[PDB]
mmCIF file of C-alpha atoms in Angstrom:
data_model
loop_
_atom_site.group_PDB
_atom_site.id
_atom_site.type_symbol
_atom_site.label_atom_id
_atom_site.label_comp_id
_atom_site.label_asym_id
_atom_site.label_seq_id
_atom_site.Cartn_x
_atom_site.Cartn_y
_atom_site.Cartn_z
ATOM 1 C CA UNK A 288 25.636 -12.681 4.038
ATOM 2 C CA UNK A 289 25.492 -9.198 2.503
ATOM 3 C CA UNK A 290 27.098 -10.080 -0.831
ATOM 4 C CA UNK A 291 24.497 -12.812 -1.401
ATOM 5 C CA UNK A 292 21.332 -11.162 -0.337
ATOM 6 C CA UNK A 293 21.603 -8.655 -3.183
ATOM 7 C CA UNK A 294 21.080 -11.527 -5.623
ATOM 8 C CA UNK A 295 17.658 -12.149 -4.029
ATOM 9 C CA UNK A 296 16.244 -9.110 -5.850
ATOM 10 C CA UNK A 297 16.697 -10.682 -9.275
ATOM 11 C CA UNK A 298 15.741 -14.016 -7.697
ATOM 12 C CA UNK A 299 12.375 -12.607 -6.609
ATOM 13 C CA UNK A 300 12.436 -10.737 -9.926
ATOM 14 C CA UNK A 301 12.256 -14.149 -11.546
ATOM 15 C CA UNK A 302 9.441 -15.058 -9.152
ATOM 16 C CA UNK A 303 7.547 -12.027 -10.401
ATOM 17 C CA UNK A 304 8.493 -13.167 -13.897
ATOM 18 C CA UNK A 305 7.125 -16.568 -12.867
ATOM 19 C CA UNK A 306 3.796 -14.848 -12.234
ATOM 20 C CA UNK A 307 3.859 -12.397 -15.151
ATOM 21 C CA UNK A 308 4.391 -15.067 -17.809
ATOM 22 C CA UNK A 309 1.844 -17.379 -16.161
ATOM 23 C CA UNK A 310 -0.948 -14.780 -16.072
ATOM 24 C CA UNK A 311 -0.737 -13.977 -19.784
ATOM 25 C CA UNK A 312 -0.966 -17.722 -20.428
ATOM 26 C CA UNK A 313 -4.526 -17.399 -19.117
ATOM 27 C CA UNK A 314 -4.975 -14.861 -21.914
ATOM 28 C CA UNK A 315 -3.759 -17.650 -24.197
ATOM 29 C CA UNK A 316 -6.380 -19.764 -22.409
ATOM 30 C CA UNK B 256 15.797 -7.230 8.415
ATOM 31 C CA UNK B 257 18.628 -9.711 8.839
ATOM 32 C CA UNK B 258 20.478 -7.481 6.382
ATOM 33 C CA UNK B 259 19.508 -4.702 8.781
ATOM 34 C CA UNK B 260 20.570 -6.641 11.876
ATOM 35 C CA UNK B 261 23.852 -7.688 10.284
ATOM 36 C CA UNK B 262 24.777 -4.125 9.295
ATOM 37 C CA UNK B 263 23.612 -2.532 12.561
ATOM 38 C CA UNK B 264 25.641 -4.942 14.710
ATOM 39 C CA UNK B 265 28.481 -4.319 12.232
ATOM 40 C CA UNK B 266 28.257 -0.707 13.378
ATOM 41 C CA UNK B 267 28.331 -1.947 16.951
ATOM 42 C CA UNK B 268 25.058 -0.139 17.832
ATOM 43 C CA UNK B 269 25.371 3.252 19.501
ATOM 44 C CA UNK B 270 25.886 1.871 23.031
ATOM 45 C CA UNK B 271 24.372 -1.628 22.695
ATOM 46 C CA UNK B 272 26.636 -4.110 20.885
ATOM 47 C CA UNK B 273 26.012 -7.639 22.157
ATOM 48 C CA UNK B 274 28.134 -10.710 22.644
ATOM 49 C CA UNK B 275 24.783 -12.206 21.716
ATOM 50 C CA UNK B 276 23.200 -12.235 18.359
ATOM 51 C CA UNK B 277 21.116 -15.221 19.301
ATOM 52 C CA UNK B 278 18.365 -14.795 16.698
ATOM 53 C CA UNK B 279 14.657 -14.932 17.502
ATOM 54 C CA UNK B 280 13.044 -17.101 19.145
ATOM 55 C CA UNK B 281 9.905 -16.362 17.156
ATOM 56 C CA UNK B 282 11.993 -15.663 14.058
ATOM 57 C CA UNK B 283 12.917 -19.327 13.913
ATOM 58 C CA UNK B 284 9.177 -19.846 14.417
ATOM 59 C CA UNK B 285 8.373 -17.269 11.715
ATOM 60 C CA UNK B 286 10.536 -19.466 9.506
ATOM 61 C CA UNK B 287 8.141 -22.294 10.340
ATOM 62 C CA UNK B 288 5.272 -20.140 9.115
ATOM 63 C CA UNK B 289 6.882 -20.197 5.665
ATOM 64 C CA UNK B 290 6.919 -23.992 5.318
ATOM 65 C CA UNK B 291 3.379 -24.014 6.688
ATOM 66 C CA UNK B 292 2.472 -21.775 3.760
ATOM 67 C CA UNK B 293 4.239 -24.271 1.493
ATOM 68 C CA UNK B 294 2.573 -27.394 2.890
ATOM 69 C CA UNK B 295 -0.773 -25.620 2.554
ATOM 70 C CA UNK B 296 -0.017 -24.745 -1.072
ATOM 71 C CA UNK B 297 1.003 -28.189 -2.345
ATOM 72 C CA UNK B 298 -2.224 -29.839 -1.192
ATOM 73 C CA UNK B 299 -4.623 -27.283 -2.682
ATOM 74 C CA UNK B 300 -2.954 -27.473 -6.073
ATOM 75 C CA UNK B 301 -3.301 -31.219 -5.622
ATOM 76 C CA UNK B 302 -7.058 -30.587 -5.495
ATOM 77 C CA UNK B 303 -6.635 -28.542 -8.684
ATOM 78 C CA UNK B 304 -5.346 -31.598 -10.575
ATOM 79 C CA UNK B 305 -8.511 -33.594 -9.887
#
């Protein structure tokens, strides 16, 4: 499993990017 | 922590290396807490659409 679980960090890094882009859309709201 | 428990059993821990590695039992139930977060989330954004 160890070779895969390192890719979770950029996977959750997209999930933080999912939040970071969505919050500034409220500034465009 | 599964990355922990994989690597620590890969050491064969200091004097306790099991022929188990039967995970949980609450960790399979802690998995069920995740989908119970997800089923709670889809219905309250469904109230957001109305």
